Amino acid sequence: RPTFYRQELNKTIWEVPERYQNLSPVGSGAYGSVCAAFDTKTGHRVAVKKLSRPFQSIIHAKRTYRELRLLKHMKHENVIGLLDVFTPARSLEEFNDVYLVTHLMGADLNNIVQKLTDDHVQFLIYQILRGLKYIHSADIIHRDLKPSNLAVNEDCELKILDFGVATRWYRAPEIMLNWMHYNQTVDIWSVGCIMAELLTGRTLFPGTDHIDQLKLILRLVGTPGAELLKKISSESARNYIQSLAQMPKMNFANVFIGANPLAVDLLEKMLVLDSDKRITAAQALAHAYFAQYHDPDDEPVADPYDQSFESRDLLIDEWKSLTYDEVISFVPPP
Numbered sequence: 001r002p003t004f005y006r007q008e009l010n011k012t013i014w015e016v017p018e019r020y021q022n023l024s025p026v027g028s029g030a031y032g033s034v035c036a037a038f039d040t041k042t043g044h045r046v047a048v049k050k051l052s053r054p055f056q057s058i059i060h061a062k063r064t065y066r067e068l069r070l071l072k073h074m075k076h077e078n079v080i081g082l083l084d085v086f087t088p089a090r091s092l093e094e095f096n097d098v099y100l101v102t103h104l105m106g107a108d109l110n111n112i113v114q115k116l117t118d119d120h121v122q123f124l125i126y127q128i129l130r131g132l133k134y135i136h137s138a139d140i141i142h143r144d145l146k147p148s149n150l151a152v153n154e155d156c157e158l159k160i161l162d163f164g165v166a167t168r169w170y171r172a173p174e175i176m177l178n179w180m181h182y183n184q185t186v187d188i189w190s191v192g193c194i195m196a197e198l199l200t201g202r203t204l205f206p207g208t209d210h211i212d213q214l215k216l217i218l219r220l221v222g223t224p225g226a227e228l229l230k231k232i233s234s235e236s237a238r239n240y241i242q243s244l245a246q247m248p249k250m251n252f253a254n255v256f257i258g259a260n261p262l263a264v265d266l267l268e269k270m271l272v273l274d275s276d277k278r279i280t281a282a283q284a285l286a287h288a289y290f291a292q293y294h295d296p297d298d299e300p301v302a303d304p305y306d307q308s309f310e311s312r313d314l315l316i317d318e319w320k321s322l323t324y325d326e327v328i329s330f331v332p333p334p
Protein backbone atom coordinates (compact mmCIF):
# COMPACT_ATOMS: atom_id res chain seq x y z
CA ARG A 1 0.00 0.00 0.00
CA PRO A 2 1.46 3.41 -1.03
CA THR A 3 2.26 6.60 0.98
CA PHE A 4 -0.58 9.21 0.80
CA TYR A 5 -0.48 13.03 1.25
CA ARG A 6 -3.28 15.45 2.28
CA GLN A 7 -4.18 18.94 0.89
CA GLU A 8 -7.39 21.12 0.63
CA LEU A 9 -8.49 22.30 -2.91
CA ASN A 10 -11.33 24.86 -3.52
CA LYS A 11 -13.20 23.71 -0.33
CA THR A 12 -12.59 19.90 -0.84
CA ILE A 13 -9.97 17.76 1.11
CA TRP A 14 -7.78 15.44 -1.17
CA GLU A 15 -5.81 12.43 0.25
CA VAL A 16 -3.89 10.80 -2.64
CA PRO A 17 -0.84 8.60 -3.21
CA GLU A 18 2.47 10.53 -3.60
CA ARG A 19 2.55 8.93 -7.12
CA TYR A 20 0.07 11.74 -8.12
CA GLN A 21 1.65 15.26 -7.93
CA ASN A 22 0.75 18.87 -8.84
CA LEU A 23 -3.06 18.50 -8.34
CA SER A 24 -4.94 21.37 -10.09
CA PRO A 25 -8.77 21.68 -10.13
CA VAL A 26 -10.20 21.57 -13.73
CA GLY A 27 -13.54 22.82 -15.14
CA SER A 28 -15.41 23.91 -12.03
CA GLY A 29 -18.28 21.50 -11.23
CA ALA A 30 -18.72 20.69 -14.97
CA TYR A 31 -16.96 17.28 -14.42
CA GLY A 32 -17.45 16.90 -10.63
CA SER A 33 -14.53 17.29 -8.11
CA VAL A 34 -11.73 16.61 -10.64
CA CYS A 35 -8.01 17.58 -10.51
CA ALA A 36 -5.45 17.44 -13.34
CA ALA A 37 -2.39 15.65 -11.84
CA PHE A 38 1.07 14.41 -12.91
CA ASP A 39 1.39 10.58 -12.61
CA THR A 40 5.05 10.04 -11.59
CA LYS A 41 4.79 6.25 -12.27
CA THR A 42 4.17 6.87 -16.04
CA GLY A 43 5.22 10.55 -16.56
CA HIS A 44 1.70 11.32 -17.99
CA ARG A 45 -0.91 13.92 -16.96
CA VAL A 46 -4.05 12.30 -15.51
CA ALA A 47 -7.38 13.40 -14.01
CA VAL A 48 -8.26 12.38 -10.44
CA LYS A 49 -11.98 12.49 -9.56
CA LYS A 50 -12.95 12.37 -5.89
CA LEU A 51 -16.54 11.11 -5.60
CA SER A 52 -18.87 13.44 -3.68
CA ARG A 53 -20.68 11.79 -0.67
CA PRO A 54 -20.42 8.38 -2.37
CA PHE A 55 -22.22 6.36 0.43
CA GLN A 56 -24.55 9.07 1.84
CA SER A 57 -27.70 7.10 0.85
CA ILE A 58 -28.63 3.77 -0.77
CA ILE A 59 -28.98 5.54 -4.14
CA HIS A 60 -25.56 7.32 -3.90
CA ALA A 61 -23.97 4.02 -2.79
CA LYS A 62 -25.49 2.11 -5.77
CA ARG A 63 -24.48 4.98 -8.19
CA THR A 64 -20.91 4.80 -6.78
CA TYR A 65 -20.82 0.99 -7.29
CA ARG A 66 -22.31 1.37 -10.81
CA GLU A 67 -19.75 4.01 -11.83
CA LEU A 68 -16.86 1.88 -10.60
CA ARG A 69 -18.22 -1.31 -12.27
CA LEU A 70 -18.69 0.51 -15.62
CA LEU A 71 -15.25 2.19 -15.48
CA LYS A 72 -13.48 -1.10 -14.58
CA HIS A 73 -15.20 -2.74 -17.60
CA MET A 74 -14.18 -0.25 -20.30
CA LYS A 75 -11.12 -1.36 -22.32
CA HIS A 76 -11.40 0.40 -25.69
CA GLU A 77 -9.56 3.25 -27.46
CA ASN A 78 -12.81 5.32 -27.85
CA VAL A 79 -14.18 4.86 -24.30
CA ILE A 80 -12.81 6.37 -21.09
CA GLY A 81 -10.84 3.80 -19.08
CA LEU A 82 -9.81 3.46 -15.43
CA LEU A 83 -6.03 3.99 -14.85
CA ASP A 84 -6.40 3.70 -11.04
CA VAL A 85 -8.96 3.70 -8.25
CA PHE A 86 -7.88 4.25 -4.66
CA THR A 87 -9.05 5.06 -1.13
CA PRO A 88 -6.89 6.37 1.71
CA ALA A 89 -8.81 3.83 3.91
CA ARG A 90 -6.85 0.73 5.16
CA SER A 91 -10.11 -1.25 5.91
CA LEU A 92 -13.82 -1.47 4.95
CA GLU A 93 -14.85 0.12 8.33
CA GLU A 94 -12.51 3.14 7.51
CA PHE A 95 -13.77 3.22 3.85
CA ASN A 96 -15.62 6.48 2.98
CA ASP A 97 -13.85 8.11 -0.04
CA VAL A 98 -13.33 6.87 -3.62
CA TYR A 99 -10.91 8.42 -6.09
CA LEU A 100 -10.89 7.50 -9.78
CA VAL A 101 -7.95 8.19 -12.12
CA THR A 102 -8.36 8.49 -15.91
CA HIS A 103 -6.46 9.97 -18.83
CA LEU A 104 -6.68 13.77 -18.93
CA MET A 105 -8.69 14.56 -22.15
CA GLY A 106 -7.97 17.86 -24.05
CA ALA A 107 -11.43 19.39 -24.89
CA ASP A 108 -15.11 18.31 -25.19
CA LEU A 109 -16.98 18.52 -28.55
CA ASN A 110 -19.21 21.32 -27.05
CA ASN A 111 -16.02 23.46 -26.56
CA ILE A 112 -14.90 22.63 -30.21
CA VAL A 113 -17.92 22.72 -32.66
CA GLN A 114 -18.04 27.06 -36.03
CA LYS A 115 -18.41 24.12 -38.50
CA LEU A 116 -15.88 21.23 -38.75
CA THR A 117 -14.52 19.95 -42.12
CA ASP A 118 -16.30 16.84 -43.54
CA ASP A 119 -13.05 14.84 -43.01
CA HIS A 120 -13.02 15.79 -39.25
CA VAL A 121 -16.74 14.88 -39.00
CA GLN A 122 -16.04 11.47 -40.64
CA PHE A 123 -13.23 10.72 -38.17
CA LEU A 124 -15.05 11.93 -35.02
CA ILE A 125 -18.37 10.17 -35.80
CA TYR A 126 -16.41 7.04 -36.83
CA GLN A 127 -14.75 6.95 -33.40
CA ILE A 128 -18.04 7.56 -31.55
CA LEU A 129 -19.63 4.66 -33.46
CA ARG A 130 -16.59 2.44 -32.84
CA GLY A 131 -16.89 3.14 -29.04
CA LEU A 132 -20.66 2.59 -29.18
CA LYS A 133 -20.26 -0.75 -31.02
CA TYR A 134 -18.05 -1.76 -28.07
CA ILE A 135 -20.34 -0.65 -25.18
CA HIS A 136 -23.49 -1.82 -27.05
CA SER A 137 -21.85 -5.27 -27.41
CA ALA A 138 -21.72 -5.44 -23.56
CA ASP A 139 -25.49 -4.51 -23.43
CA ILE A 140 -24.50 -1.15 -21.97
CA ILE A 141 -26.51 1.85 -23.19
CA HIS A 142 -25.03 5.32 -22.70
CA ARG A 143 -28.47 7.08 -22.73
CA ASP A 144 -26.98 10.60 -22.37
CA LEU A 145 -24.69 10.99 -25.40
CA LYS A 146 -24.19 14.71 -26.16
CA PRO A 147 -21.19 16.85 -27.15
CA SER A 148 -20.16 17.58 -23.50
CA ASN A 149 -19.78 13.74 -22.93
CA LEU A 150 -17.26 13.44 -25.82
CA ALA A 151 -13.63 14.40 -25.32
CA VAL A 152 -11.06 14.83 -28.08
CA ASN A 153 -7.27 15.38 -27.86
CA GLU A 154 -5.27 17.73 -30.26
CA ASP A 155 -4.71 14.53 -32.38
CA CYS A 156 -8.57 14.28 -32.84
CA GLU A 157 -8.64 10.94 -30.92
CA LEU A 158 -12.06 10.81 -29.24
CA LYS A 159 -13.33 9.06 -26.10
CA ILE A 160 -16.91 8.54 -24.94
CA LEU A 161 -17.43 9.50 -21.25
CA ASP A 162 -20.40 10.27 -19.00
CA PHE A 163 -19.76 13.19 -16.63
CA GLY A 164 -23.42 12.92 -15.37
CA VAL A 165 -25.89 21.06 -23.62
CA ALA A 166 -29.48 20.20 -22.50
CA THR A 167 -29.72 16.34 -22.55
CA ARG A 168 -33.22 16.67 -24.17
CA TRP A 169 -31.63 18.18 -27.38
CA TYR A 170 -29.85 14.86 -28.13
CA ARG A 171 -32.43 12.45 -26.72
CA ALA A 172 -34.36 9.88 -28.84
CA PRO A 173 -38.11 10.62 -28.99
CA GLU A 174 -39.02 7.05 -27.71
CA ILE A 175 -37.28 7.93 -24.36
CA MET A 176 -38.30 11.63 -24.26
CA LEU A 177 -41.22 10.45 -21.98
CA ASN A 178 -42.60 6.97 -20.81
CA TRP A 179 -39.15 5.15 -20.99
CA MET A 180 -40.56 1.49 -20.91
CA HIS A 181 -39.58 0.45 -24.52
CA TYR A 182 -36.21 1.28 -26.10
CA ASN A 183 -33.03 -0.32 -27.47
CA GLN A 184 -29.34 0.54 -27.86
CA THR A 185 -30.22 2.79 -30.86
CA VAL A 186 -31.37 5.59 -28.45
CA ASP A 187 -27.60 6.30 -28.56
CA ILE A 188 -27.56 6.25 -32.40
CA TRP A 189 -30.27 9.00 -32.37
CA SER A 190 -27.94 11.09 -30.17
CA VAL A 191 -25.04 10.45 -32.62
CA GLY A 192 -27.27 11.68 -35.50
CA CYS A 193 -28.04 14.90 -33.53
CA ILE A 194 -24.30 15.36 -32.75
CA MET A 195 -23.18 14.70 -36.37
CA ALA A 196 -25.84 17.17 -37.71
CA GLU A 197 -24.47 19.85 -35.29
CA LEU A 198 -20.80 19.13 -36.30
CA LEU A 199 -21.78 19.50 -40.00
CA THR A 200 -23.98 22.64 -39.60
CA GLY A 201 -22.62 24.44 -36.47
CA ARG A 202 -26.20 24.46 -35.06
CA THR A 203 -28.12 22.34 -32.55
CA LEU A 204 -30.45 20.19 -34.69
CA PHE A 205 -33.39 20.13 -32.20
CA PRO A 206 -32.98 22.93 -29.62
CA GLY A 207 -36.29 22.17 -27.79
CA THR A 208 -37.25 24.51 -24.85
CA ASP A 209 -39.07 21.58 -23.10
CA HIS A 210 -40.08 17.92 -23.82
CA ILE A 211 -43.18 18.95 -25.87
CA ASP A 212 -41.25 21.57 -27.96
CA GLN A 213 -38.51 18.91 -28.34
CA LEU A 214 -40.97 16.35 -29.88
CA LYS A 215 -42.47 19.13 -32.10
CA LEU A 216 -38.99 20.02 -33.53
CA ILE A 217 -38.14 16.31 -34.05
CA LEU A 218 -41.43 15.47 -35.85
CA ARG A 219 -40.99 18.63 -38.04
CA LEU A 220 -37.83 16.97 -39.54
CA VAL A 221 -38.67 13.21 -39.41
CA GLY A 222 -42.48 13.50 -39.87
CA THR A 223 -45.34 12.22 -37.67
CA PRO A 224 -45.42 8.44 -37.00
CA GLY A 225 -46.61 6.29 -39.90
CA ALA A 226 -49.28 3.55 -39.53
CA GLU A 227 -46.48 0.90 -38.99
CA LEU A 228 -44.91 2.84 -36.05
CA LEU A 229 -48.26 3.92 -34.52
CA LYS A 230 -49.25 0.15 -34.27
CA LYS A 231 -46.22 -0.33 -31.89
CA ILE A 232 -47.12 2.49 -29.38
CA SER A 233 -48.60 0.77 -26.25
CA SER A 234 -49.13 4.03 -24.23
CA GLU A 235 -52.71 5.33 -24.86
CA SER A 236 -51.55 8.84 -23.68
CA ALA A 237 -48.62 8.71 -26.19
CA ARG A 238 -50.97 7.52 -28.98
CA ASN A 239 -53.57 10.26 -28.19
CA TYR A 240 -50.78 12.96 -28.21
CA ILE A 241 -49.36 11.66 -31.59
CA GLN A 242 -52.72 11.24 -33.32
CA SER A 243 -53.90 14.74 -32.11
CA LEU A 244 -51.01 16.39 -34.06
CA ALA A 245 -51.74 17.69 -37.58
CA GLN A 246 -49.90 15.16 -39.85
CA MET A 247 -46.34 16.11 -41.00
CA PRO A 248 -44.26 14.63 -43.84
CA LYS A 249 -40.67 13.42 -43.39
CA MET A 250 -38.44 16.18 -44.83
CA ASN A 251 -35.94 15.27 -47.60
CA PHE A 252 -32.70 15.58 -45.50
CA ALA A 253 -30.85 16.70 -48.71
CA ASN A 254 -33.04 19.90 -48.59
CA VAL A 255 -32.16 20.43 -44.85
CA PHE A 256 -28.36 19.68 -44.82
CA ILE A 257 -27.87 21.62 -48.07
CA GLY A 258 -24.25 21.29 -49.36
CA ALA A 259 -23.37 18.35 -47.02
CA ASN A 260 -21.56 15.23 -48.35
CA PRO A 261 -24.49 13.12 -49.74
CA LEU A 262 -23.06 10.11 -47.87
CA ALA A 263 -23.25 12.11 -44.57
CA VAL A 264 -26.89 13.01 -45.42
CA ASP A 265 -27.67 9.33 -46.22
CA LEU A 266 -26.18 8.22 -42.85
CA LEU A 267 -28.19 10.94 -40.99
CA GLU A 268 -31.37 9.61 -42.66
CA LYS A 269 -30.50 6.12 -41.26
CA MET A 270 -29.70 7.44 -37.72
CA LEU A 271 -32.66 9.84 -37.31
CA VAL A 272 -35.37 7.24 -38.14
CA LEU A 273 -38.30 7.66 -35.78
CA ASP A 274 -38.95 3.87 -35.53
CA SER A 275 -36.12 2.52 -33.28
CA ASP A 276 -36.65 -0.99 -34.79
CA LYS A 277 -35.49 0.51 -38.14
CA ARG A 278 -32.70 2.82 -36.91
CA ILE A 279 -29.13 1.84 -37.95
CA THR A 280 -27.00 0.14 -35.25
CA ALA A 281 -23.43 1.21 -34.41
CA ALA A 282 -22.00 -1.98 -36.09
CA GLN A 283 -24.07 -1.33 -39.25
CA ALA A 284 -23.13 2.41 -39.28
CA LEU A 285 -19.38 1.60 -39.18
CA ALA A 286 -19.81 -0.29 -42.54
CA HIS A 287 -21.55 2.82 -44.10
CA ALA A 288 -19.78 4.25 -47.18
CA TYR A 289 -19.34 7.59 -45.28
CA PHE A 290 -16.56 5.87 -43.19
CA ALA A 291 -14.77 4.20 -46.18
CA GLN A 292 -11.55 6.10 -45.19
CA TYR A 293 -11.51 4.73 -41.56
CA HIS A 294 -13.64 1.49 -41.40
CA ASP A 295 -11.51 -1.57 -40.55
CA PRO A 296 -13.77 -4.56 -39.70
CA ASP A 297 -10.69 -6.28 -38.06
CA ASP A 298 -10.14 -3.27 -35.70
CA GLU A 299 -13.70 -2.61 -34.37
CA PRO A 300 -13.65 -4.88 -31.34
CA VAL A 301 -16.57 -5.97 -29.13
CA ALA A 302 -16.50 -5.92 -25.35
CA ASP A 303 -16.30 -8.72 -22.82
CA PRO A 304 -19.72 -9.46 -21.29
CA TYR A 305 -20.74 -7.11 -18.46
CA ASP A 306 -22.73 -8.48 -15.54
CA GLN A 307 -25.41 -5.84 -14.87
CA SER A 308 -27.40 -8.24 -12.59
CA PHE A 309 -26.69 -5.77 -9.70
CA GLU A 310 -29.00 -3.17 -11.37
CA SER A 311 -32.05 -5.26 -10.32
CA ARG A 312 -30.85 -5.55 -6.64
CA ASP A 313 -32.26 -3.57 -3.65
CA LEU A 314 -29.50 -3.60 -0.99
CA LEU A 315 -28.51 -1.56 2.10
CA ILE A 316 -25.94 1.26 2.05
CA ASP A 317 -23.23 -0.85 3.79
CA GLU A 318 -23.80 -3.68 1.26
CA TRP A 319 -23.27 -1.37 -1.77
CA LYS A 320 -20.34 0.09 0.19
CA SER A 321 -18.77 -3.39 0.76
CA LEU A 322 -19.28 -4.35 -2.92
CA THR A 323 -17.62 -1.05 -3.95
CA TYR A 324 -14.72 -1.78 -1.56
CA ASP A 325 -14.36 -5.28 -3.13
CA GLU A 326 -14.05 -3.64 -6.59
CA VAL A 327 -11.39 -1.14 -5.35
CA ILE A 328 -9.32 -4.04 -3.86
CA SER A 329 -9.65 -6.33 -6.95
CA PHE A 330 -8.66 -3.50 -9.41
CA VAL A 331 -5.74 -4.53 -11.69
CA PRO A 332 -4.14 -1.55 -13.45
CA PRO A 333 -3.76 -1.71 -17.26
CA PRO A 334 -0.14 -2.66 -18.17
Ligand SMILES: Nc1c(C(=O)NCc2ccc(C(=O)NCCCC3CCCCC3)cc2)cnn1-c1ccccc1
Residues within 6 Å of the ligand: 026, 027, 031, 034, 047, 048, 049, 067, 070, 071, 074, 079, 080, 100, 101, 102, 103, 104, 105, 106, 107, 108, 135, 140, 141, 142, 151, 160, 161, 162, 163
Ligand atom coordinates in the same frame (compact mmCIF):
# COMPACT_ATOMS: atom_id res chain seq x y z
N1 LIG B 1 -12.61 16.32 -16.64
C1 LIG B 1 -11.86 15.40 -17.23
C2 LIG B 1 -11.61 14.08 -16.86
C3 LIG B 1 -12.29 13.42 -15.74
O1 LIG B 1 -13.17 14.01 -15.09
N2 LIG B 1 -11.91 12.17 -15.49
C4 LIG B 1 -12.55 11.38 -14.45
C5 LIG B 1 -13.76 10.65 -14.96
C6 LIG B 1 -14.40 9.70 -14.18
C7 LIG B 1 -15.53 9.05 -14.63
C8 LIG B 1 -16.03 9.30 -15.90
C9 LIG B 1 -17.14 8.52 -16.53
O2 LIG B 1 -17.30 8.55 -17.74
N3 LIG B 1 -17.95 7.85 -15.71
C10 LIG B 1 -18.95 6.92 -16.20
C11 LIG B 1 -18.19 5.69 -16.72
C12 LIG B 1 -19.00 4.78 -17.52
C13 LIG B 1 -19.53 5.31 -18.80
C14 LIG B 1 -18.42 5.52 -19.84
C15 LIG B 1 -19.00 5.91 -21.19
C16 LIG B 1 -19.99 4.90 -21.68
C17 LIG B 1 -21.10 4.73 -20.69
C18 LIG B 1 -20.56 4.33 -19.33
C19 LIG B 1 -15.41 10.27 -16.67
C20 LIG B 1 -14.29 10.93 -16.21
C21 LIG B 1 -10.72 13.59 -17.84
N4 LIG B 1 -10.45 14.49 -18.76
N5 LIG B 1 -11.17 15.60 -18.39
C22 LIG B 1 -11.21 16.73 -19.27
C23 LIG B 1 -12.06 16.71 -20.37
C24 LIG B 1 -12.13 17.82 -21.20
C25 LIG B 1 -11.36 18.94 -20.93
C26 LIG B 1 -10.53 18.95 -19.83
C27 LIG B 1 -10.45 17.85 -19.00
Ligand code: NA
Residues within 6 Å of the ligand: 143, 144, 145, 167, 170, 171, 172, 186, 190
Ligand atom coordinates in the same frame (compact mmCIF):
# COMPACT_ATOMS: atom_id res chain seq x y z
NA1 NA C 1 -30.29 10.62 -24.58
